[PDB]
Design a protein around this motif. Sequence first.
Motif, PDB file in Angstrom:
ATOM      1  N   UNK A 129      22.435  25.079 -17.126  1.00 15.30           N
ATOM      2  CA  UNK A 129      22.632  25.585 -15.923  1.00 15.30           C
ATOM      3  C   UNK A 129      22.107  24.506 -14.715  1.00 15.30           C
ATOM      4  N   UNK A 130      21.251  23.739 -14.969  1.00 13.62           N
ATOM      5  CA  UNK A 130      20.976  22.560 -14.242  1.00 13.62           C
ATOM      6  C   UNK A 130      22.131  21.535 -13.817  1.00 13.62           C
ATOM      7  N   UNK A 133      24.189  23.460 -11.506  1.00 15.07           N
ATOM      8  CA  UNK A 133      23.433  23.509  -9.928  1.00 15.07           C
ATOM      9  C   UNK A 133      23.522  22.158  -9.452  1.00 15.07           C
ATOM     10  N   UNK A 172      30.497  16.680 -30.808  1.00 11.23           N
ATOM     11  CA  UNK A 172      30.280  17.031 -29.698  1.00 11.23           C
ATOM     12  C   UNK A 172      29.988  18.530 -29.608  1.00 11.23           C
ATOM     13  N   UNK A 173      29.563  19.091 -28.453  1.00 10.35           N
ATOM     14  CA  UNK A 173      29.007  20.215 -28.231  1.00 10.35           C
ATOM     15  C   UNK A 173      30.212  21.282 -28.481  1.00 10.35           C
ATOM     16  N   UNK A 174      31.466  20.969 -28.326  1.00  7.15           N
ATOM     17  CA  UNK A 174      32.488  22.048 -28.450  1.00  7.15           C
ATOM     18  C   UNK A 174      32.557  22.324 -30.091  1.00  7.15           C
ATOM     19  N   UNK A 215      18.642  33.077 -18.186  1.00  2.00           N
ATOM     20  CA  UNK A 215      18.063  31.859 -17.442  1.00  2.00           C
ATOM     21  C   UNK A 215      17.988  32.156 -16.017  1.00  2.00           C
ATOM     22  N   UNK A 216      16.763  31.671 -15.510  1.00  4.95           N
ATOM     23  CA  UNK A 216      16.718  31.809 -13.929  1.00  4.95           C
ATOM     24  C   UNK A 216      17.035  30.240 -13.126  1.00  4.95           C
ATOM     25  N   UNK A 217      17.475  30.401 -11.989  1.00  6.00           N
ATOM     26  CA  UNK A 217      17.693  29.001 -11.370  1.00  6.00           C
ATOM     27  C   UNK A 217      16.293  28.539 -11.023  1.00  6.00           C
ATOM     28  N   UNK A 218      16.161  27.018 -11.275  1.00  7.36           N
ATOM     29  CA  UNK A 218      15.019  26.335 -10.734  1.00  7.36           C
ATOM     30  C   UNK A 218      14.256  26.838  -9.575  1.00  7.36           C
ATOM     31  N   UNK A 219      15.151  26.989  -8.609  1.00  6.92           N
ATOM     32  CA  UNK A 219      14.590  27.233  -7.203  1.00  6.92           C
ATOM     33  C   UNK A 219      14.234  28.693  -7.140  1.00  6.92           C
ATOM     34  N   UNK A 220      14.642  29.575  -7.947  1.00  8.73           N
ATOM     35  CA  UNK A 220      14.296  30.972  -7.886  1.00  8.73           C
ATOM     36  C   UNK A 220      12.724  31.242  -8.475  1.00  8.73           C
ATOM     37  N   UNK A 248      29.441  26.710 -26.032  1.00  8.96           N
ATOM     38  CA  UNK A 248      28.360  25.511 -26.305  1.00  8.96           C
ATOM     39  C   UNK A 248      28.460  24.183 -25.727  1.00  8.96           C
ATOM     40  N   UNK A 249      29.688  24.352 -25.396  1.00  6.38           N
ATOM     41  CA  UNK A 249      30.223  23.119 -24.335  1.00  6.38           C
ATOM     42  C   UNK A 249      29.972  23.367 -23.155  1.00  6.38           C
ATOM     43  N   UNK A 292      22.889  28.303  -5.223  1.00  7.33           N
ATOM     44  CA  UNK A 292      22.398  28.378  -6.791  1.00  7.33           C
ATOM     45  C   UNK A 292      23.606  29.470  -7.176  1.00  7.33           C
TER      46      UNK A 292
END
Lengths: 49, 81
Positions: A37-38, A41, B3-5, B17-22, A32-33, A22
């Motif tokens: 985090x998923x 990961x 687009x996000x840019x 934001x934490x990792x899902x596994x954490x 933004x682009x 992780x």
Amino acid sequence: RIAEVDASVVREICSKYIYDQCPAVAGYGPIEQLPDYNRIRSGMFWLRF
Amino acid sequence: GREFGNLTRMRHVISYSLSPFEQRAYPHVFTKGIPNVLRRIRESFFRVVPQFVVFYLIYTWGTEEFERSKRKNPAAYENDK
């Protein structure tokens, strides 16, 4: 100690610390682009291997 | 295009934001989860239910009145005498 290094050792240790671990992320912007985090990961491992 | 840019501009709004596994997939379920759903139900309840309650009264009446409309066949013969 450097001459001792070999490609198998490299792949072994890099798999030991990089593969399917992780990530910690610090992004000072603009942003933004940059992937959520998923996505990162899940970006840490291949489905082919 | 969108687009996000290239979307809305925004300026220094830091986030964390934490990792899902954490972290557990079911944090404090009883202490906070259920009461939240209950507060939500208590908010929606009076807004939603009464019209449906109104519907039921009409539904009950309609069937019952129709029962008077038909099953009270004897009232008509009774009218015959």
